[PDB]
Amino acid sequence: AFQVAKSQEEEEHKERMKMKKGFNSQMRSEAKRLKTFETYDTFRSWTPQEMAAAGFYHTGVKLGVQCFCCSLILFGNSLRKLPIERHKKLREEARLESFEDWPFYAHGTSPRVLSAAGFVFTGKRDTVQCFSCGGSLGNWEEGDDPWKEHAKWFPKCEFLQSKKSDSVFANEELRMDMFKDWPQESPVGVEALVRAGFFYTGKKDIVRCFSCGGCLEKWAEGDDPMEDHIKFFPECVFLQTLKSSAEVIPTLQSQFQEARSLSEQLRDNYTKATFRHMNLPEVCSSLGTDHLLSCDVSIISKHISQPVQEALTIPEVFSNLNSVMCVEGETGSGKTTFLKRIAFLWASGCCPLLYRFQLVFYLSLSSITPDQGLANIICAQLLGAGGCISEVCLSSSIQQLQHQVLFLLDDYSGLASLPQALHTLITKNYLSRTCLLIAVHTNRVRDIRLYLGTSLEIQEFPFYNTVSVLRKFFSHDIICVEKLIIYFIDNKDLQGVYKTPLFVAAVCTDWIQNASAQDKFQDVTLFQSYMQYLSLKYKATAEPLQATVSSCGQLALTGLFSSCFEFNSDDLAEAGVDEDEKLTTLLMSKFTAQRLRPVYRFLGPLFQEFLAAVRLTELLSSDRQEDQDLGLYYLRQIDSPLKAINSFNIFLYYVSSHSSSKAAPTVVSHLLQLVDEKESLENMSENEDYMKLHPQTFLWFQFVRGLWLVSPESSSSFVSEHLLRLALIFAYESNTVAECSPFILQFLRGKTLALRVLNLQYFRDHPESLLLLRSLKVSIFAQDEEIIKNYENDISEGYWKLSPKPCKIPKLEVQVNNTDAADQALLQVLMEVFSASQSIEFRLFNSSGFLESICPALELSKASVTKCSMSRLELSRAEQELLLTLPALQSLEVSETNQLPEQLFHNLHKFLGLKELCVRLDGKPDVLSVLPGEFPNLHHMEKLSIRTSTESDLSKLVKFIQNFPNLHVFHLKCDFLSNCESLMAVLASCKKLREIEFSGRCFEAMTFVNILPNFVSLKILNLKDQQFPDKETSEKFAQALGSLRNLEELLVPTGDGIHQVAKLIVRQCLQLPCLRVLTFHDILDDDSVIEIARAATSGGFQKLENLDISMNHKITEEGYRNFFQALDNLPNLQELNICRNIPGRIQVQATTVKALGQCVSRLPSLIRLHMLSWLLDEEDMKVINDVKERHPQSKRLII
Amino acid sequence: FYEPPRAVSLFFNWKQEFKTLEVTLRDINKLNKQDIKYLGKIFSSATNLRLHIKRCAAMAGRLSSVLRTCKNMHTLMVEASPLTTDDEQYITSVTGLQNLSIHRLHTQQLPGGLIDSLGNLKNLERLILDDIRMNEEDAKNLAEGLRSLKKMRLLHLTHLSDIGEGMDYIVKSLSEESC
C-alpha cells in the first residue's frame, strides 16, 4: 500500500542521487537502442521497442529512464501505465497506400479532407485509424467532423494534442571552413572528418564528398572517420589515390528497359496493400494489422559450430544480412509473419537501409512442388511474371542484378528436388550472389544445414508480449488483465507455458468469444481453450490427428512416467508413424545436430503434463478393457499422499478440467486410498520435476516436514485440508455429487478439520451429511497465516451463505496467542458459530486484551462450554466470575500462575461435569476448605494434576480421592509430603490405577512395592528423581515391576540401583510385549548397557519405539559394543538421547563412533537420535550425512 | 604411505568389515596435527591392524600420541626409527599386539622399557630382534621377561653384541616347559 511510495522514495531517491547524467544530444541513435534494449535483464511486462520509441532512454540497469524535455529518472515499469502516455502525464507512403483502397460507400464525407486531417485507411470496409492511435472504426454518418470525430470517437489518442497543440569550396581550407559549422551532437574527431575528403551541406549528419560524392548515412557518436567511406564507397577517386585496392582489404574484412521497367512493375506490385491480411484475428476479425497493432519477438542467432552466438533483433538482421539463411519457429505463426513482415514493411521504408533493397520474393512451398520455376508460382499465386521477358530471362534479371535480391523462401520440409530452377538454385547458391531466406521447422534443419552460415531461432518473450497483445486487443476488459499480471507472480512460471506468441489467438477467443474466463481465470481454462483450438484448427474426424492427440498423450505418459522429458526416440510404440501429422500437429519435434540417436523436444515441458491430462480423461471415460487399466496403472504408480499436494495439485488440477465423471470415483478413490503414511515424504522429495512453484515446491516439502516435525495431527490436518480441498474442487466440478457422496462420507470421518469455508459453493451441496467431521479448529502458530497465503495464492460469509439455518453443528476448537485484540466483529462470528456448534474447545495462550474480549464473548454466549485452557492469564476476579457462573463445564486446565485462584476454585467446587484441572506452581496447605463442597457433586473426573508447595490436609484427599470410581491419568509432583500411609490408603483402596505420573515428589517408595502388586493392568508409569538402592528397591521393585507386563511407557529415575536391577528389570521389560517408551535417566553404567546389549540381542523387543539412555557415566568403544548390538538388532526403535555429560566427552573414539553411525543406519525405523555433548568434525558430518542419506526414513539427528 | 586427504576420503565414505589392513609408513618428517588426526582415524576400518614403521623421524616420541585412538592393532614392525622408553611402555601397554619386529637400534636399551615390561604382551607369538644395543644384565631381565610369556612360537635374536653369558639365561628361559 504505502510501501510502494516509501520504497518509491527509497530506490527512486537512491537512484535520484546516483545517475542524473544525461547526454541529450547523444541518445537518438536507433542501433544502440535496439541493441541495448534487447540483451538486458528483461523481467518486466513492458515492450522495449516503443519504449525505445517513447521519448525516453535507458541503459539496461533496472529500468531507470530519462529524457530531454522532462529530465527525470523513471523505473519500476508496472501495469497499465503506458510509458508513451506516461511520457506525457509525467512531464508520404502510408497516407498514399491508405486512400488507394478507397471504396464507393463513404462519400458523404470527402476523402481529401480525410487526407488533410491525418487519417490512415487499413484496406477493409470504410474503416480508419490514425498513424499513432490504434483504433480502426467505421460508423460513418452525415456531418462527421473528421478531426473532431477523432477528438470524439474515443479519448485514447493523445497524438491529437501531442501533434496539434559548395562549388567554390573545393579545397580543405574552404572544405574545413564549411566544417567549422560543426554540429554539437558529434563528439567524433572533426579534423579527421575534414581529412576524410568530405564537406558539409547543411542538414543533420549527411556529408558530401567532392571526388565521388560520398554523403551517406551511419553517422553516430563513436564511429570511425574513414571506415564508412571506404567500405561503402570503394570507388572514390581521391580515396583511390589515398587507399587503393590492397588497402581496402582490412575494411573488406571489417564489413535494360525490360529489366529496369520490370523492377518498376514488380516494385509497384510488391507494395500490395491487401497483402497485410492475416488470420491471427481469425473469427474475432478485429480491425487491425499485426505490426502496428501487435508486438514482436527476437532472434536467437546461433552459430553452426555450437556457440549460441547472439540474440539479435529485426534491424540487426538488416545490418549483417545472410546470403542464405534458415529460421525455426511455427508456420502460420511468426516465420511467415516474419517474411510478410519483411515484404509489407518493405512497402514502408523507415530503416536507414530501406528503399534501396531491390527484389524480395515471398514463397510458401508447402502447397507446391510444381517442377517449374518462376512463371509457375508468380503467375499462379501472384499476378504474373511477364511474357515478353522469358522465365529464364526473368531468371536472367535475377542473375544480372544479384547483389540486392532478397528471398523469403518457406518450407523446404515439404519440398523435394522436383522444382528445377528452385532446387538447382538452392544447391548452387553461389551462382546467384543473392540473399536467400528460408523458414523450415526443427524437424528438417539438416537438409538446409549444408547451405547455411548461421541458424536463426524465433522465440517468444512472454514477459511482455502476452500483456502487449492482451493489452492492446483487450483494452475493453482490463481487470482480468490485472488477474493475469497478479497471476504472473503467484505463478512465476507463467513464462513456462506461453511458448508461442501467435497461437495466443485461442486466448483471444477465450476472452471475446468465451467470456467464462473473465470469472474463471486460472490456467486450465486457458490452455483447455488452447486444446479446444487444436480441435478447431485442423478440424477433422477420428484420424491419427486424433490418435496423434491420444498417442502423444501416451508420449506424455512416458513423459511423466519416468520423468523423462527430452526423449530417446527409441520407444515410438506410443505414437510412431507419419511424423508429418505430429509435427504439422506440432506436439513435439526432434534434435538438430548430431546425437547417437536424436532427441525429441517439446514446445512446453509443463504443457506436456496437460497432454497427459487429455490422456488421463481418455483413460478415464472410455473403453474399459485395459485402457483404464493403463490410466489406473500409472494412477496407482503415484500413490503417496505427501506427493499428492504438489504433484496432484498441478497435474490433477490439469485433470480438474474435462468433466466427464465415468471414473472420477476411481481417482477420488485414489484420493481416499491415501492413508497415514511416512515414506510419502521422500517419495515426493526423491522426484526431479516440480512444475510451476518450483523452489516454492521445495519449500512446501520443507514446511510440511516442519508440520510433521511438531504435530502429527496438524500435519495430517493440513493434508486433510489440501486433499479435501482439491477433492472438493474435483468433486463439484466433476458433478459426482450424488454419485460419490457416501464414499466422500468415508473421506470425511475421523479427520479433524480447521474451519475453511470460502469455496462454499463447492461444499454446500449437502452439508448435513458433510457435517460429521471429527473436530473443528480455529486459532489466532504461523500455520493459519500460511493458509491465508494459500487461499491468497469470510468465516460467517461462506458459513451462513453456505447454510441459512445450520443443524447439529459439531464441537469446536479455539487457540489464542498473546498478540490478540478484542474486535467485536469476529466476536459476532463467534456468537454465530457458538450458537451453531455443540460445545466449545477453548485454549488461552498468554492472551492479553482478552478480558475485554471474554466479557462480550460469554455475554453473547449461553451456558454451553466444555474446554478452557488457562495458559498464563492475568487472574482477575470478574472474568472468572463470568466463567464461573456458566454450568456444564467439563474441562479446565490450570498449570501456570504462582498467583492462585480462590473464588474460581472454591466456587468451581459447585457445578457438575468438570473433569480437568491443574495445580502446577500454586502452593496450598489450607485452600482445600470448600473442596468438600465438591465432594457430594462429582464422581465424574478424568484429569487430576496437583502441585503444592508444602503439605496440605490429606484426610479429605484420601476420603474422596478414595471415593473415585473412574480413575485416569494422574500428574503428581513436588512437595514435602512425608506421608506414605494416607497415599498408601488411597492408592490401596482404588481400582483403575493404570496411568501414573509421580514425577519427583518427596516420598518413600515402600508403598509402591505394596500397591503395584494390587494392580496389574497399568500401562504408563513416570517417575522423577527418588531414592533407589540396589537390593531393597532392586529386589522388591524387581518383583513388583516383574509382575507388571501390561505397561507401555516406562520412566525410571536416578538411583545407585545397579546392574542387578538391569538383570531382573531389563530381563522382565525385555520379556513383555505391548511396550513403547523406555527411559533410564541418571542410571545405566556400562555393565547395565551390557545388560541392554545382550538382552537387546535376542529380541522380544519388536514392539518398542521410544528409548532414552541420557546420563551414562562414560560412553566409549564400550558404548560402541553395547549400542552396537543394542542399536543393531531391533527394527522398530525411533528415540535415543545421549547427552548432558557436558564438558569433555570426546573420549568416544570418533571413528568408531562413525562405525556406530553405520550401526544406527542399520536401524530402519528410527527418527530421532540425539548425539549431544561431544565434538564433531568435518569428517563425521560427512559420514552421518552420507549414511543418513542411505535410507532417508530418519530426519532427526540432533547435534 | 610415502613421505593425505584423498585416502582419508577413500576410507571415509563407506565402512565395511575389512579383515586386516597393512600400513606402510615411509619417512615421516613433517608432522602436523591434521594428518595425525586423519591418519589416526583411518585405522579403524579393519578388524586387525598391521603397522609398519619405515625410517620415520617425526615418530621418535609420538608413538602413543597418535596411536591413542588406535585401539585396533594386530602386529607392528620397527624399521630404523628413534624410540623412547615410554613409547616402549606403550608397546607393552597394549594387549592385542601379537607379533612384533624391531630393527636397527643404535642407542642403548634403557631399563623400564620394552625388555623390562616384556611380560605384558600375553598373545606374543612372533618376535623379531635385530641390531639392539644392550648389555648382559639387560639380556638377563630380558630373559626374565621371556619367562613370563608362554604363547610364543617364533623368535629372532639376530645380530646382537654385549651378550656374554646372557644366552644361558635366554636358553634357560626358553627350555623350561614344552612351549
Side-chain angles (χ1 to χ4, degrees), chain A residues 1149-1152 1158 1179 1183, chain B residues 12 15 38 41 44 69 71:
Chain A
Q1149 191 177 3
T1151 181
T1152 308
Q1158 301 295 112
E1179 295 297 328
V1183 172
Chain B
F12 286 172
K15 282 84 167 180
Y38 286 171
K41 295 298 186 292
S44 296
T69 307
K71 183 62 66 68

Side-chain angles (χ1 to χ4, degrees), chain A residues 98 197 223 399 457 466 613 1114 1130:
Chain A
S98 297
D223 293 333
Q399 293 181 357
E457 179 179 0
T466 178
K1114 179 178 74 175
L1130 302 171

Side-chain angles (χ1 to χ4, degrees), chain B residues 28 69 83 113 130 132 140 147 167 177:
Chain B
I28 298 170
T69 307
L83 188 63
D130 184 74
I132 308 297
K140 292 182 183 181
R147 292 180 184 270
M167 290 295 172
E177 197 183 3

